mmCIF file of C-alpha atoms in Angstrom:
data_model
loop_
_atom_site.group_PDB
_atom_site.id
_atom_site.type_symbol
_atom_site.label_atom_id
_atom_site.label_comp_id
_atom_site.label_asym_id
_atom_site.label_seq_id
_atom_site.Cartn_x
_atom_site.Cartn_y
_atom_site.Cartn_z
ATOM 1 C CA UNK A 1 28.757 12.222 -24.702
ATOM 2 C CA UNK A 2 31.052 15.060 -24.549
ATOM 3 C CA UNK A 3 27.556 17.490 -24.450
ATOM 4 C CA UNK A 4 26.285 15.476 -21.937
ATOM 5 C CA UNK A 5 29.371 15.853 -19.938
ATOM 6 C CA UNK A 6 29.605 19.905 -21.002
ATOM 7 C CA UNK A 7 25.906 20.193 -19.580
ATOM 8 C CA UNK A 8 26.436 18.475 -15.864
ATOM 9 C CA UNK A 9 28.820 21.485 -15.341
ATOM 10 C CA UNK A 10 28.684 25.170 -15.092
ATOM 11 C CA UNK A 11 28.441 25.425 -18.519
ATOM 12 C CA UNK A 12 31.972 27.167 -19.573
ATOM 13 C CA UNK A 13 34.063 25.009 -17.267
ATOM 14 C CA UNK A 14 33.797 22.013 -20.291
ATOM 15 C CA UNK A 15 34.429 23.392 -23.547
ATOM 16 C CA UNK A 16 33.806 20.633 -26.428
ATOM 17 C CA UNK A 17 35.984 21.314 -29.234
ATOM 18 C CA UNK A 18 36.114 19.967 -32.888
ATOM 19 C CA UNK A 19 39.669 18.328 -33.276
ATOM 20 C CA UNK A 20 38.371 15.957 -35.532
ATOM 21 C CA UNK A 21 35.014 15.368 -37.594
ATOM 22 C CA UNK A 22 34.296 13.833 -33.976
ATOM 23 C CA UNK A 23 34.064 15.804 -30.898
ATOM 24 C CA UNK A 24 36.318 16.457 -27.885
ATOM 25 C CA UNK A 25 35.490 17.735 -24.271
ATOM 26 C CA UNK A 26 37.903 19.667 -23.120
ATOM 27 C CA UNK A 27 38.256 21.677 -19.145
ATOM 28 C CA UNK A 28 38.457 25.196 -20.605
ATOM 29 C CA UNK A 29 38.455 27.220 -17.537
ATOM 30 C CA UNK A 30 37.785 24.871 -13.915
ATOM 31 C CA UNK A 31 37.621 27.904 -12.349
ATOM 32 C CA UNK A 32 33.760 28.583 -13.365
ATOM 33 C CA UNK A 33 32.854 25.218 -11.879
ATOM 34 C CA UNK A 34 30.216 25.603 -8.940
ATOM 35 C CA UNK A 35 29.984 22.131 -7.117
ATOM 36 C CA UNK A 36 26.788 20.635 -7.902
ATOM 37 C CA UNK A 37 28.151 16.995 -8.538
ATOM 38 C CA UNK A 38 25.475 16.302 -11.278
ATOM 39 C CA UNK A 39 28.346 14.191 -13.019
ATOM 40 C CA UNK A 40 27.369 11.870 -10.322
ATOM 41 C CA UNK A 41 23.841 11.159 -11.399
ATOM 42 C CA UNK A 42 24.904 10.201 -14.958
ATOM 43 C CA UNK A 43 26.129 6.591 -14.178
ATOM 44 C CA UNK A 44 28.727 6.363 -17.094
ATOM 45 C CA UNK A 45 30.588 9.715 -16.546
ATOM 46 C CA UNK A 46 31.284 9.261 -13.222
ATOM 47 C CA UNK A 47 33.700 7.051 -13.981
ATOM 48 C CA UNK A 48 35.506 9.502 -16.271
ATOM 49 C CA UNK A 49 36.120 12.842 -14.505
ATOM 50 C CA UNK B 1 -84.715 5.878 -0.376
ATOM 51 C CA UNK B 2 -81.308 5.433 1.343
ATOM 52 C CA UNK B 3 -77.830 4.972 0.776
ATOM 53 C CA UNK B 4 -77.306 1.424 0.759
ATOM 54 C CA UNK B 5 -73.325 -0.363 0.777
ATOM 55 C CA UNK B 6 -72.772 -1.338 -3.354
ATOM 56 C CA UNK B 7 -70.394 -4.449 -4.662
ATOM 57 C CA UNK B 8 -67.020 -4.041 -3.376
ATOM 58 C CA UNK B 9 -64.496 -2.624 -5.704
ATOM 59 C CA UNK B 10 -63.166 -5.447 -8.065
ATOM 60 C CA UNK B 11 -59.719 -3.527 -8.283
ATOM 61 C CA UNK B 12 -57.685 -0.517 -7.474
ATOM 62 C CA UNK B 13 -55.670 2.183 -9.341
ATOM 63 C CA UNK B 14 -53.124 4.571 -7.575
ATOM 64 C CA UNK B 15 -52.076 7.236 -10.365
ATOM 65 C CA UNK B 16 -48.479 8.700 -9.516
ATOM 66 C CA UNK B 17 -46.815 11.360 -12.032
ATOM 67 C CA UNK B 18 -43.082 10.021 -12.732
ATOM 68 C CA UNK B 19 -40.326 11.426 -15.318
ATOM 69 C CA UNK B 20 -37.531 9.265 -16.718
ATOM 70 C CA UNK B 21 -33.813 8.168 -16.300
ATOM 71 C CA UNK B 22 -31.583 10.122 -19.655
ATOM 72 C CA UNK B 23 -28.410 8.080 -20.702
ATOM 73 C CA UNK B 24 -24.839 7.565 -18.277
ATOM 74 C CA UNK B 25 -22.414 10.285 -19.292
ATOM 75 C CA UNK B 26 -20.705 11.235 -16.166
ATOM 76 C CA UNK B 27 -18.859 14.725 -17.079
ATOM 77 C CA UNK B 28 -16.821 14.555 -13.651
ATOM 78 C CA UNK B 29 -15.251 17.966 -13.989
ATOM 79 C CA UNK B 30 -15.164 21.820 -16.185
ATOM 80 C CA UNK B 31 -11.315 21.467 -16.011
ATOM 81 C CA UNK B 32 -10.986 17.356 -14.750
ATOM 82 C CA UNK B 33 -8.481 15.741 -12.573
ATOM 83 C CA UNK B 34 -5.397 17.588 -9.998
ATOM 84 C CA UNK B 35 -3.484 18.729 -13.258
ATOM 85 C CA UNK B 36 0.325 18.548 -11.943
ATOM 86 C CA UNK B 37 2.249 21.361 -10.855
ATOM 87 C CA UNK B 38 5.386 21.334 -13.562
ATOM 88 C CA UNK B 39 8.258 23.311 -15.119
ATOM 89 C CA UNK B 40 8.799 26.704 -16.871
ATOM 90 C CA UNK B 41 10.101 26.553 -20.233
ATOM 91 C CA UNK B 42 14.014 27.364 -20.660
ATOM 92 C CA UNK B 43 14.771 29.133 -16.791
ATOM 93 C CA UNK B 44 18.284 29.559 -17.022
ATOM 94 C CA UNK B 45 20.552 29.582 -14.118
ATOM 95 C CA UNK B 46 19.726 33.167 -12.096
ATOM 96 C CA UNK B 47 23.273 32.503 -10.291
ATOM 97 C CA UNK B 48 27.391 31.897 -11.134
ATOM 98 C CA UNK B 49 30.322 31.629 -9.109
ATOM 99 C CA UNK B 50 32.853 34.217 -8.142
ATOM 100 C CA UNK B 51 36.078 33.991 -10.338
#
């Protein structure tokens, strides 16, 4: 889920990491972010950022 | 010595020239149906923010 989430975004505002053998979405650099609200469309993320 | 009127005709034949019917295929179309209008491959964003 943390692609998902990296893909509704300008794509370097989410960078997903590897902290573990699972992996973590992290907000590398909000500046990048262009509002397009796509987040909004998934129905299960929306709730999360 | 005349022409005199015979036996009337016992039956009649109309001749008509006719072809025949070859079997239902119905090709509708070269290229068939309103094939739908639809996405190029990869795109890419052709735009990014300022900072």
């Amino acid at each position: 889920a943390a692609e998902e989430l990296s893909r509704c975004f300008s794509p370097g505002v989410i960078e997903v990491q590897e902290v573990q053998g699972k992996k973590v979405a992290r907000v590398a650099n909000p500046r990048l972010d262009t509002f397009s609200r796509e987040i909004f469309r998934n129905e299960k993320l929306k709730k999360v950022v | 010595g005349g022409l005199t009127c015979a036996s009337a005709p016992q039956g009649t034949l109309r001749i008509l020239e006719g072809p025949q019917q070859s079997l239902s295929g119905s090709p509708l179309q070269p290229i068939p149906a309103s094939p739908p209008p639809q996405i190029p491959p990869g795109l890419r964003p052709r735009f990014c923010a300022f900072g």
